[PDB]
């Protein structure tokens, strides 16, 4: 039951009590993922329009 690193100031204080010791994707890759999804949306809408054209 030890207390360490006691720090005190006008607005409070803090300390540590020890009970027992122990025993990314680049900006380029993000645009590609965003554009790949936009492309799949365009492809799906194109097939919808193609279906409606028939």
């Amino acid at each position: 039951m030890e207390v360490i690193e006691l720090n005190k100031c006008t607005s409070g204080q803090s300390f540590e009590v020890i009970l027992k010791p122990p025993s990314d994707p680049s900006l380029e890759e993000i645009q590609k993922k965003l554009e790949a999804a936009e492309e799949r949306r365009k492809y799906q809408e194109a097939e919808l329009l193609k279906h409606l054209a028939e």
């Binding site: 720090n7 100031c9 607005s11 409070g12 803090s14 009970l19 990314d24 999804a37 949306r41």
Partner: protein
Amino acid sequence: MRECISIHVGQAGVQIGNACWELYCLEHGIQPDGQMPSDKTIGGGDDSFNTFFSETGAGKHVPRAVFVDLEPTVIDEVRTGTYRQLFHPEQLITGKEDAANNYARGHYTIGKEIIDLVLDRIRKLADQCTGLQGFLVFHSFGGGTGSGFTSLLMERLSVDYGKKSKLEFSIYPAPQVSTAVVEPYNSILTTHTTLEHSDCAFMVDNEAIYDICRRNLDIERPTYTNLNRLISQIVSSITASLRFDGALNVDLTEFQTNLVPYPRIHFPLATYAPVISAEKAYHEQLSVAEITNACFEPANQMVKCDPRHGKYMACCLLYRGDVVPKDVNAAIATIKTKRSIQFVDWCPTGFKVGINYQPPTVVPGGDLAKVQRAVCMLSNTTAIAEAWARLDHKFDLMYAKRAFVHWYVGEGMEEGEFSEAREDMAALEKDYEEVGVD
């Protein structure tokens, strides 16, 4: 002094953000018009409260915050609300149609078209900072914007601000206050993509906040206002160290150093006491031992789970009010001899304690009563993995039938991203089990 920028995404993030900045102002003595009589340095200064507030030459203290929502109705409340004067228009970003509770719609379809604008508005706030620490991101799991756009924003923040820390305050989906059936999908999609970009995340289960409001506050049917004022009290307790003089959790980095020894396991359980009804005749003020002992009751945890059947990796005790170190140690000793507290063998068995002498501030006319002392415990327990289990189970129930998957694929997302995100969660649950169980 090092600045912190708060980012509020989606309805949950915006509305919770509104409640916090209202509280922040009452705590720092800032008026709705931004004036701060106690700030003797007019138009500048590097005090602790400046980490969250900039200052204009006219003496206005402006939050370092950005609000983002793909639909204008929630953010218009901020534009015409009590604290409309705090913010300027550049800080509030709103689209015209939301993500329809569709992660893929917020991340891809709509996110791609607004991401650069939000980054520009954030860059403006960063340019006022002489030493930016990082970001605090408020959002929900279940919303299409809070889930789908947030993960996009976090990816770009890591690219634009590589060396900056990022903390999360995330709203875990609860059916009692939810009306979107696909929220398990969104929660798991956004956790998968955000996991490597968040240094520390404080999950709040709406179920827990809901029951605390009905049980302790005697609210039969709590509203978002009720839920948000309670949430902002907890948020305030966590961010106080950044806004006040002190030596514990004085910058965002210390949050990871003190609470997250293993990076993926960065979801500390929050526990808060006491929560007393303002409508009460008059309550017996609890001692340091009683509120400390309350930190180990499942009833006041921000996520219902049983820490008795996990292992602790870290534990912070954040006190506010009339608390002296002698009483904390005495209460702590008493709790060890009675409570089940098992630490992982590769971590010390101890507690970091921070005390702020100013007691919790309560919103006038709110639901919470003024108390002489309060505490918020932040503990990294493997027991919070119960939350992932619940969520991953619901995910599996719908995904087995591919129910609702067409809504996501129709927005340009690939079905394989579902299983990819699920396998990441499966590994996350396995990490917890390796650290907690024998």
